[PDB]
Design a protein around this ligand. Sequence first.
Ligand SMILES: O=C(O)CNC(=O)C(=O)O
Ligand SMILES: [Mg+2]
Ligand code: NI
Ligand SMILES: [Zn+2]
Length: 331
Amino acid sequence: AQNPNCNIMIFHPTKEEFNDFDKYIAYMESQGAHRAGLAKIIPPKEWKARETYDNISEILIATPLQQVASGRAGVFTQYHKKKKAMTVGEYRHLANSKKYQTPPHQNFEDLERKYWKNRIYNSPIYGADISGSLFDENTKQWNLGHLGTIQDLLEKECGVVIEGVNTPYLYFGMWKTTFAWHTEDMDLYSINYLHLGEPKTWYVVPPEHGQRLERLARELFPGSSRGCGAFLRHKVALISPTVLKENGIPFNRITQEAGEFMVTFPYGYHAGFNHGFNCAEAINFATPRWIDYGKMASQCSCGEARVTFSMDAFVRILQPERYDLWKRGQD
Ligand SMILES: O=C(O)CNC(=O)C(=O)O
Ligand SMILES: [Mg+2]
Ligand code: NI
Ligand SMILES: [Zn+2]
């Protein structure tokens, strides 16, 4: 068995190996990358996502989200308070202001300490889930707006044609902006490209140990757990590395820098935070190995998790027994 300790693996594909996305995902898994739940891919030195980022300030963040925390430093929830629209130019200015800017620090480790110590006492503003792409249309390799669709993968594997589309999303972040512990919708893969700015730190639980994380979460968030059998689908719960270690939960951590891809694998729980002003782009995707995870994915039916149009068909074809109840939650 490749990568038995489930370490996060880092790949350095050549420009030749960067041509065929599917084949490279398959190669990574042949080396055991999926066991970690997360991998880093450093693109070849010849490659670029686009020529410059000099002209992005007029993108609109229609609904910036203020992330308000409750709980204790290592075990908290966050809710998202809607703010008035602002442009990326205005957001970058806000990120850099004295109130919101990254504090002086020695290194990534010092900054990680300061994040877990102090995150709960601030409410950073996140420009999340903005439909769109920053990849130049002429970028042919690993262009997140030109991947094969999850609807075509399901059709190719299973023979059934379904409605739905699959497009990327942009994330504008600042210091302390936070992504809660989650897996992807329908336990899909994700890919995330850090286009510009300051780093993003990630934590991940191996897919084979996901249920250990869920069991801890039910103990740490007991009211949430009673309210819904899959409350991590709400994307609001945070548990620190210190707390995970104290409870024997297997995990790994890695920091992503501008110009690097991350891939999360089916049923790999992940969480993390931004170091300062940045811009990431991400999309879900599927492979043949995903299908079995799709069929077994938990679902939120309490009504909070409210998800895309395109998830309907996945639940309808892969989870016909669940479909009724899950759709009652959606409607
Ligand atoms: O970048 C973020 O805020 C969150 N991203 C992810 O959870 C992902 O790419 O799967
Ligand atoms: Mg612009
Ligand atoms: Ni994710
Ligand atoms: Zn729920």
